Amino acid sequence: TALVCDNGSGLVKAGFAGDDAPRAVFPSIVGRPRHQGVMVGMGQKDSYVGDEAQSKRGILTLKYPIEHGIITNWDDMEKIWHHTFYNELRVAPEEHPVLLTEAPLNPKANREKMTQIMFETFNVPAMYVAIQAVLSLYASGRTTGIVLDAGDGVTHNVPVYEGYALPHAIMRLDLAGRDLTDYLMKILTERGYSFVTTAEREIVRDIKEKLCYVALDFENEMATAASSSSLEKSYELPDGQVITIGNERFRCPETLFQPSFIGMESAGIHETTYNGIMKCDIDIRKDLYANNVLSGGTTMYPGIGDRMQKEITALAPSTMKIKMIAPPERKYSVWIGGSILASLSTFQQMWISKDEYEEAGPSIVHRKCF
Amino acid sequence: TALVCDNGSGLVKAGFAGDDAPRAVFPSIVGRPRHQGVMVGMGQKDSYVGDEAQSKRGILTLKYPIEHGIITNWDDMEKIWHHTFYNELRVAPEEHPVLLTEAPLNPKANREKMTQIMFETFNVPAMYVAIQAVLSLYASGRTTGIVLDAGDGVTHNVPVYEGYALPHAIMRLDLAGRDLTDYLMKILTERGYSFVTTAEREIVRDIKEKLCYVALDFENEMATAASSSSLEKSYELPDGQVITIGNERFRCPETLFQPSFIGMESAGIHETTYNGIMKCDIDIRKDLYANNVLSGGTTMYPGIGDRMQKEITALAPSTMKIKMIAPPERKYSVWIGGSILASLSTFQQMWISKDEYEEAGPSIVHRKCF
Amino acid sequence: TALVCDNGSGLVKAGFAGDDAPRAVFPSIVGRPRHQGVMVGMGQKDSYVGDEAQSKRGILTLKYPIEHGIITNWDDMEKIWHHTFYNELRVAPEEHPVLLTEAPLNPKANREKMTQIMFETFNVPAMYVAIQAVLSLYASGRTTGIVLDAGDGVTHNVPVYEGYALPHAIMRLDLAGRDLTDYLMKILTERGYSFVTTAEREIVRDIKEKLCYVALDFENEMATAASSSSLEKSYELPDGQVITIGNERFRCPETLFQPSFIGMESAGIHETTYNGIMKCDIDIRKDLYANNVLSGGTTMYPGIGDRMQKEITALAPSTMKIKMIAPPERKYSVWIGGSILASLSTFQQMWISKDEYEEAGPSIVHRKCF
Amino acid sequence: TALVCDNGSGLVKAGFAGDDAPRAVFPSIVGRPRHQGVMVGMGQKDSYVGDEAQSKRGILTLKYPIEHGIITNWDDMEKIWHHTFYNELRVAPEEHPVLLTEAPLNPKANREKMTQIMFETFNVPAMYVAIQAVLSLYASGRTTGIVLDAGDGVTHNVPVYEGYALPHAIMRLDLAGRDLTDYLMKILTERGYSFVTTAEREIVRDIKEKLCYVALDFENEMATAASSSSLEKSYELPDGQVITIGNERFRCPETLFQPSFIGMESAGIHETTYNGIMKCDIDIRKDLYANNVLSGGTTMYPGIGDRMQKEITALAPSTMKIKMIAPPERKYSVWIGGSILASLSTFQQMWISKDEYEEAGPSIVHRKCF
Amino acid sequence: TALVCDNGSGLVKAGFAGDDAPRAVFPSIVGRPRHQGVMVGMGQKDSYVGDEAQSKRGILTLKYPIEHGIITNWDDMEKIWHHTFYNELRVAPEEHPVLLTEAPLNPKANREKMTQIMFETFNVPAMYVAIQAVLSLYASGRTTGIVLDAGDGVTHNVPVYEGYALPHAIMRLDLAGRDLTDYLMKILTERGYSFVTTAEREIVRDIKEKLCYVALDFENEMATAASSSSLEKSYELPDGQVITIGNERFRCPETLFQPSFIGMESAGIHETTYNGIMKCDIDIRKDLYANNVLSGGTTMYPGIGDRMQKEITALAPSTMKIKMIAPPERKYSVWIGGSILASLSTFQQMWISKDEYEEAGPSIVHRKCF
Numbered sequence A, B, C, D, E: 001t002a003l004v005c006d007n008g009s010g011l012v013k014a015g016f017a018g019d020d021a022p023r024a025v026f027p028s029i030v031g032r033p034r035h036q037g038v039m040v041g042m043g044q045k046d047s048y049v050g051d052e053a054q055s056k057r058g059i060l061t062l063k064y065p066i067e068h069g070i071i072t073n074w075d076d077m078e079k080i081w082h083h084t085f086y087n088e089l090r091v092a093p094e095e096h097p098v099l100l101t102e103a104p105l106n107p108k109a110n111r112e113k114m115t116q117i118m119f120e121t122f123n124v125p126a127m128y129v130a131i132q133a134v135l136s137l138y139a140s141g142r143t144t145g146i147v148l149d150a151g152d153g154v155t156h157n158v159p160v161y162e163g164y165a166l167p168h169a170i171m172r173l174d175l176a177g178r179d180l181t182d183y184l185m186k187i188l189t190e191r192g193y194s195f196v197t198t199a200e201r202e203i204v205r206d207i208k209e210k211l212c213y214v215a216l217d218f219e220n221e222m223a224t225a226a227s228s229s230s231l232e233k234s235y236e237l238p239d240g241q242v243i244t245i246g247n248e249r250f251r252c253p254e255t256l257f258q259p260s261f262i263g264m265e266s267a268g269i270h271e272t273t274y275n276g277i278m279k280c281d282i283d284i285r286k287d288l289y290a291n292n293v294l295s296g297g298t299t300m301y302p303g304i305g306d307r308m309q310k311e312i313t314a315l316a317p318s319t320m321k322i323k324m325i326a327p328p329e330r331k332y333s334v335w336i337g338g339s340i341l342a343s344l345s346t347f348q349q350m351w352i353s354k355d356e357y358e359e360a361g362p363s364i365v366h367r368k369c370f
């Protein structure tokens, strides 16, 4: 069988070919002990990875090896891959071909080094590099549609029509769930709650995950929040302290719609999708208007679909029918398509093998993968 | 039975001998993918033809194998014939005679290679090539008249009398529906609408089909258009943008009457018809004055008959009676006449059979066809 | 005297009649503050225009009011004109005639509104709208030639012969320096350099102007660039980081020769030039084959003339003599030739006066200018 | 001295009396610009005539003032005479007698208005119009012969014996070099080269002048041209494109001998000559059989004399001696012969002087000339 | 006139507008008796404040109501403002507008309650709250630069450029002089010097003020301290005991560069500044590299400027010209900028009026202040 290992910015999701649920979903963390070990009989390990690092975070310093989808340090990243293959899959890569995902429009050295690490360090029999939006489109059981995929680090619109993607219409924006978490950290100081280290960064991430939702409108929702207490909710910290939050419940995800909140110049995801489809040819825009496919955890907020449909309808011409595909299982959808892709017979000749590698050099991946 | 398959410049119209309507009418286009395919499956083809190519046209490049009645790309034309016989009519030509149509004054290699392809690639038992406008007149049940046939690529006047075609009088002008469409594409930029590549050319062709007409008097029509908005009309694109066109409706067809709009020196359709008549002998001119038979979709613009009647009447002698035959089904006359002409018993000896072809080479069609 | 003011897509170039070089050459930018001001002073303005906008770009959003030769933002364009007249040239327009240039086949409402603003907001004594390529041909001191004028937004070919333009042979393509800049941004992410903001677009534009060149051949040059680092050059960002670029030096302008790179379908500028020369009557092609006139900033790449001469010669017949006119000062050509228009006496009857405007409405610009 | 100004259908040949060559030999065309002029600083004229119009033809529409030996555009013809006198011969008209030429059986108003505008617009002291073929005979230095003269617009046979021309046997046919060129244009489309404008008509005339000849036997030459490529020849357009033409080299001339090619009911020029002899009395026929003299550029085709030998010999009685008189300079005959006649003393009693015109009106040329 | 009142974490500085030396500067201390008072007299007061409390610290317990810039105990700090208004400045609140300062990213209730108390308990005519870093930059007489302001409780980097702040680039750390003095306690225990109660906190603060300096590089300085007796210095305690300190001279402020010394995870102030500018736009970073402004008492150490510059040159790229602006009077820099703002004419329109408060509640001071 085959392995699908989505190395997202925040969460690594891994599984075998054909399965409907991932055998692995864990944060992409490398943790190192920031204080001095004093217990010899118990001892310590130089670095902790995955959920193991995620439980004892009170002592560790946490590093994301993936930042905005670009691999920044390869050492901790290969440690994360070693975890995935050995500890959690308990599998030997040498007898299983590996499928990897990646955000569109990324530096070539990135995929270069992933190929080199897979084939030399891990010696995979074959390996492929694919685009996350295409895999999400596969997961939707469709062939025509525009994928708006926003993970932890990257958001991107990729429109595909009758299976032909349009690279000139691909739009990429480096503003995603991690930057939302950072904005939540910056704004939670408004009510006197201070979080400065990565460990409490994870608390703020959990807060955004459990409490935040996307309002249908901004200004009237601001008025309602400033006029009543019905919108304030309470959350219990790991120490037992209780924090009540109000408008910042929805001001965090709305950064996806007004990047100006975090000082970015580009427009929101609605406007980015609109431009990414306007760059498309006339005859297909219709089919794209009714096939807005969403993927990644950043679009799991309650009511995001209704807000974004309202926005597009406002910018769209009145006659058109805008229909948004928001599957309940979309935060695994990018992974899910990989499971289908690895199970497709007509893809079995698309793997990049060791044989072609050793003759074509590392630059092979760019004349066999889009 | 027999097959009648008008390979017009823009639309292929095909059917069986004897019917009152062609079984399949579809645009003569060949589309090839212009982008890179990312969905791996079993539905993508190297090239798409016919209406199926017309529907996905946003993502294909469209080539017309027929230009000004001259067949330019033989491979694609062969593909279009394969589509017509095997998919639309679902017939095996090897057991059916075929009637083909051709514009007058054409390169001899064109019909020689048509004959070669029919006799070798498709193994047609016998095939005839007929002048299109002669067939259109046979449709109207006459033996006398001047046929002014304007298809998509070529316009031509042939005056005939008692079944005797007069070779010294045929007038051929390479100014027809495609050039009108291109002129509309050039002049639509006046109102800010841009249509640059092959996909939207079909859209402009559709606007020309649904909204254009020929003015009775051009200058007063400009006065009306620049004085009020009663002639401005709105059309919706596939993407919902609503375009308003004013004079643009009638400036496109008048290119048939003032070729100088597109830079052509040859005179208009009316004067071309008048010259095609005045090149004839005198004692028959009268019968041609009252039997102006029009055909081809380029002649379905509302008011073409009345305007061209005014023009010829102006050029004609005063005591002469000018009458024009404008069948509501004229854009199919070229086909329907063939359905008649292929059914006449007096034809059954006019077919060019295989046996004579194998002994006379490609040159036989020159000494057995007008 | 008379004022000539080329409103190019990227750079506005202005001066008085007779001078051999534009007095004011500055980019066409309106910049607005994207951040909230905290130092309460008297120097902060709602919008900055020209070089003063260029310098402060790190804190402003830059908009071009001109896109692809069609003006989309009217008010900021009025502001840019306010800069040109009052600050750069320091001139009162009320008593100097103004010469304005425009790309061919532009929406008629565009020059309609330019004329309206000139005759109402600035009340110019008179103004003429000339076609840019004609003025550039003036600069060459000729009367016959095919001008390929490519600025920041528009690439257009005009053939003229003994000074008569052939309107049916005009060719226009909305792909120019701006689109090359955008492509350069899209492909600089290949090496890990990310440029997303409007100010950073300007930096990529400077990169393009400094380190890009046109390759004589493309495949062999790719082989060379992938074989050695001799083509890789270094450049410093305004913040001092050093970037090394290899093949991306010559992949950026090759879009002018393979628009399929950027997703457009229309052919490259060499094939567009060939089609433009082909649409003309036969007896003149020879003269145009040896009078290929280049203008605009888009054609200052080293070696563009040699490559495009190679291309035309490959398409052109063997006997024909291909000669290219690439003056060193061609960037200002459209300007300097206009200076001749204003200084040539037999033209002071071609101005559109206020007096005839007040009676003929804003439509007068149409029947006195090509 | 006197002026000989042969106003042929296509080529005007003018000069002084007594010279052996015409000083001015230029095409009789008027060209008008068919496009809009944009070069304000170049010396455009309303119309170009003569070789200057010949050069700029690629941008001009060409009108021939003379069709079939009859001036249809009189204003253009006065323009052509103005160029002849003031620009080519650079001679003051009022102080020089002028000798004009005319084909027989030409409508009387033609010569009437010729004389009128010579005596009123140009104030010529005296002129003379003569039958062109009579002057052609005078060139040959004979008093006997049947002159066949075929110019650009008219072919005609006149028999003259001892200086007595016999009007009742004079034959005229309106089939000449112009219709030859038109038929050449019609038949060049068989190989796929299309010439439609007046400019390309001139190119086709040049191909006619360079590559056509008269075949001794038609069907033998058809067999030779259909069996081998020995007869094909290649010609180069002003653009550098190359045509290859085979049998069309000898089909274009022979419509002289088989007018049914272009649909004329009249017999060939050989049969017309034989009829012109046969309508003559018996006693003189022999002298005309051996004295068939040719003139006019339409008779410059190689092999015309031998072919006329063969055909007339086939028609004429066997015991009669037949002889072609084809001087190498016969295409100047109509001019040079006049130079002799205008210098003969016996002429200066036969000029139509101004004085007798002022009393006899335009009709004087009728009773003082043949 | 207007009052400028900086409530720093450790030192309160209050004065009038326009002055150059603070009329009042004193520790923000509230002291309460900790023992039983046995003498019956008129001098024993419930609670002591400011300098006079700093004198009686022996029998007092001291409380800072400002901890990390956020106000905790409102009653004692209200007493503090009362003492500043009445005993220090000897003025009445009701007839003098007041300007207050606040660290960036500070909770909502802090400044709402500050404005509340000012406008109701003290009845100030008008109040304003501004950002300390901005006023410190005002002190430098500049309009562009990144301020690093480190007081007793809060350090923060705020980059601004031509009066426009970049809120996404503001960096705040709760590590300042108070934490430094606590660290100095924690490390003085090695040499047997013990300081536990709040009274000796002032002693150790005086020690830190009088003795510590920033080493150019930490490690060679540590080797020097462990190798020789050149550096240790003697301080005279209030009780007469003398202490000699060595490496603890430069270990105390090194915490600002390596917060891991006090268990914090964040990077040092050098890396904090470099990141804070890296968040800003590219086109501006160079300007900020030359305009590093240090302010507050925490950057008064000898040698801090050289070490900070050295570190930044290590992190910053090579060519950059890095300049640190360290005015000798920076301890009051944050104050004096207010003395400008309160006196600046353009600012007299920015105050929050009592009239506007009585309608908008506490929420007014937020939509008109940054």
Ligand SMILES: Nc1ncnc2c1ncn2[C@@H]1O[C@H](COP(=O)(O)OP(=O)(O)O)[C@@H](O)[C@H]1O
Pocket (backbone or CB within 6 Å): A006, A007, A008, A009, A010, A011, A012, A150, A151, A152, A153, A177, A178, A205, A208, A209, A210, A212, A295, A296, A297, A298, A299, A300, A301, A331, A332
């Ligand atoms: N219910 C939720 N609401 C809001 N955000 C969520 C939710 N679940 C996950 N996320 C965010 O989505 C981000 C991306 O996770 P995922 O969708 O797996 O893509 P990837 O891990 O590839 O970036 C996570 O960083 C997380 O913060």
Ligand SMILES: Nc1ncnc2c1ncn2[C@@H]1O[C@H](COP(=O)(O)OP(=O)(O)O)[C@@H](O)[C@H]1O
Pocket (backbone or CB within 6 Å): B006, B007, B008, B009, B010, B011, B012, B150, B151, B152, B153, B177, B178, B205, B208, B209, B210, B295, B296, B297, B298, B299, B300, B301, B331
């Ligand atoms: N209703 C209409 N009005 C105007 N033009 C039409 C109409 N219908 C068809 N046409 C044009 O006529 C052209 C030629 O079609 P047709 O008459 O069938 O001749 P052909 O044999 O070239 O297909 C088409 O390209 C189409 O653009």
Ligand SMILES: Nc1ncnc2c1ncn2[C@@H]1O[C@H](COP(=O)(O)OP(=O)(O)O)[C@@H](O)[C@H]1O
Pocket (backbone or CB within 6 Å): C006, C007, C008, C009, C010, C011, C012, C150, C151, C152, C153, C177, C178, C205, C208, C209, C210, C295, C296, C297, C298, C299, C300, C301, C331
């Ligand atoms: N030296 C150069 N090399 C390459 N490109 C250049 C150079 N100078 C200018 N350009 C490009 O040419 C574009 C247009 O230049 P210009 O001729 O001023 O056109 P416009 O008339 O639109 O102002 C600019 O956007 C710039 O990117």
Ligand SMILES: Nc1ncnc2c1ncn2[C@@H]1O[C@H](COP(=O)(O)OP(=O)(O)O)[C@@H](O)[C@H]1O
Pocket (backbone or CB within 6 Å): D006, D007, D008, D009, D010, D011, D012, D150, D151, D152, D153, D177, D178, D205, D208, D209, D210, D295, D296, D297, D298, D299, D300, D301, D331
């Ligand atoms: N060498 C030649 N071969 C074939 N045709 C010729 C040649 N020279 C001239 N002609 C044709 O003869 C025509 C008539 O020329 P010419 O004999 O001078 O009579 P005209 O007096 O009508 O000009 C010209 O139009 C030209 O096309």
Ligand SMILES: Nc1ncnc2c1ncn2[C@@H]1O[C@H](COP(=O)(O)OP(=O)(O)O)[C@@H](O)[C@H]1O
Pocket (backbone or CB within 6 Å): E006, E007, E008, E009, E010, E011, E012, E150, E151, E152, E153, E177, E178, E205, E208, E209, E210, E296, E297, E298, E299, E300, E301, E331, E332
């Ligand atoms: N010469 C000095 N050297 C080192 N630290 C100092 C010096 N002077 C003052 N400090 C420290 O600076 C801190 C902040 O004082 P100040 O600059 O007034 O800011 P604020 O009072 O606004 O917090 C004080 O707690 C003090 O410990």
